[PDB]
Write a protein that binds this DNA or RNA. Structure first.
Ligand SMILES: [Cl-]
Ligand SMILES: [Cl-]
Ligand SMILES: [Mg+2]
Ligand SMILES: [Mg+2]
Ligand SMILES: [Mg+2]
Ligand SMILES: [Mg+2]
Ligand SMILES: [Mg+2]
Lengths: 108, 107
RNA sequence: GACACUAAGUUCGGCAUCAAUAUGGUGACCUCCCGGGAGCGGGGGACCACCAGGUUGCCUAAGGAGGGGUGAACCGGCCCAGGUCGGAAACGGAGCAGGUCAAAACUCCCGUGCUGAUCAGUAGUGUC
């Protein structure tokens, strides 16, 4: 996009609003999902990642990265003013979410 | 109007920039806001513990590492509460010296 | 004419490149105060590392304060979104991610010293 607006843009936006209900109902069987009281939980989880680096983000097995090198968890916790447990929690949900995605597809 | 005493102030494991306020020679291992309050209250000082407050220069979030302690120096009229305690430095030091004596530490 | 010797030319490689100083910086750490209800505001000393361009030792066959790079998950310095902490607030602090760099560290390429080999066969001199 270029500070402007093309039909593809309008398209992609409508498209985002699509992979909603789905992705939303995919959060179905995952203890860690009250609309407003959820947004926070979702914004938190994001801010925590706002502290991870590319290599950590783009890792097929993020859980392990952090597993194997705990210092990374500490770096992240402290870097996002959140607790350590919080980070490990975010890490497990990401796992559950991964495993889930596996049983189905991924992009959708 | 009471004053502020953060454990970082009395921590010999912290550098200057990390919040240490007294010479390492007088500083202490890992003073806990609790211990600080427990020695101050036991000298005739008026003080209350702010259990959950956290020192800004304290990256850690654990418990042994947080809390704040508040002591009354002067009295509304102006007179110091305890002649032997002018400044804040005075209290910090007095605390740094008495904690390594708390039974809970000599244990 | 053919060979030699000194000066010397081309190219691809190898080995190797101080010390101690002033002034100004940046950073780190320590140590004293004043002010303040916090985050802090203010001021004096000490030590170490590094940088900018500036000397000199009486220093080596050489040793220029040259030009890049990388900067690591964190573990160098800066700027630090968000979030976090102190704060009623204003703000301030610690600080990851991200960006960045006269000044943690580590590395190249320059130059400069010897140095194999290569190519040229010019400059002089000498011999038969
Ligand atoms: Cl001070
Ligand atoms: Cl630590
Ligand atoms: Mg010869
Ligand atoms: Mg980088
Ligand atoms: Mg880094
Ligand atoms: Mg912020
Ligand atoms: Mg800061």
């Amino acid at each position: 996009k270029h500070g402007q607006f093309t039909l593809r843009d309008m398209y992609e936006q409508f498209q985002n609003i699509m992979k909603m209900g789905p992705f939303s109902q995919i959060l179905g069987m995952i203890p860690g999902f009250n609309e407003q009281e959820s947004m926070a939980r979702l914004k938190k989880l994001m801010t925590i990642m706002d502290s991870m680096n590319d290599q950590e983000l783009d890792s097929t097995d993020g859980a392990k990265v952090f597993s194997k090198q705990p210092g990374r968890i500490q770096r992240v916790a402290r870097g996002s003013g959140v607790s350590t447990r919080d980070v490990q929690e975010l890490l497990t949900q990401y796992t559950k979410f991964a495993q889930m995605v596996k049983k189905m597809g991924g992009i959708k | 109007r009471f004053i502020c005493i953060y454990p970082a102030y009395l921590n010999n494991k912290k550098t200057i920039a990390e919040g240490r306020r007294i010479p390492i020679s007088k500083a202490v291992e890992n003073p806990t806001a609790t211990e600080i309050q427990d020695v101050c209250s036991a000298v005739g000082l008026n003080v209350f513990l702010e259990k959950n407050k956290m020192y800004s220069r304290e990256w850690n979030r654990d418990v042994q590492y947080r809390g704040r302690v508040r002591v009354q120096l002067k009295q509304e009229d102006g007179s110091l509460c305890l002649v032997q305690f002018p400044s804040r430095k005075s209290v910090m030091l007095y605390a740094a010296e008495m904690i390594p004596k708390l039974k809970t530490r000599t244990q």
